[PDB]
From Swiss-Prot:
Organism whose genome encodes this protein: Human immunodeficiency virus type 1 group M subtype B (isolate HXB2) (HIV-1)
Zn finger limits (CCHC-type): 2-19, 23-40
Effect the entry attributes to changing H12C: Complete loss of infectivity and in vitro chaperone activity
Function of the protein: Encapsulates and protects viral dimeric unspliced genomic RNA (gRNA). Binds these RNAs through its zinc fingers. Acts as a nucleic acid chaperone which is involved in rearangement of nucleic acid secondary structure during gRNA retrotranscription. Also facilitates template switch leading to recombination. As part of the polyprotein, participates in gRNA dimerization, packaging, tRNA incorporation and virion assembly.
PTM field: Methylated by host PRMT6, impairing its function by reducing RNA annealing and the initiation of reverse transcription.
Domain of life: Viruses
Site positions for Cleavage: F5, N6, C38, T39
Effect of C38H: Partial loss of infectivity
Name of this chain's protein: Nucleocapsid protein p7
Residue ranges the record marks as coiled coil: none
């Protein structure tokens, strides 16, 4: 279902989530790096 980019629990988005944004990958789902770090773009 819909899930969050911040914390990644379903039934809400990062725009709803007031859990501040996380250290893991905001996108690719791994956590051995952050959203900046991730070579998903590159
Ligand atoms: Zn969330
Ligand atoms: Zn990543």
């Amino acid at each position: 279902n819909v899930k969050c980019f911040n914390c990644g629990k379903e039934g809400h988005t990062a725009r709803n989530c007031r859990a501040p944004r996380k250290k893991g990958c905001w996108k690719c789902g791994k956590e051995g790096h952050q959203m900046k770090d991730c070579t998903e773009r590159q």
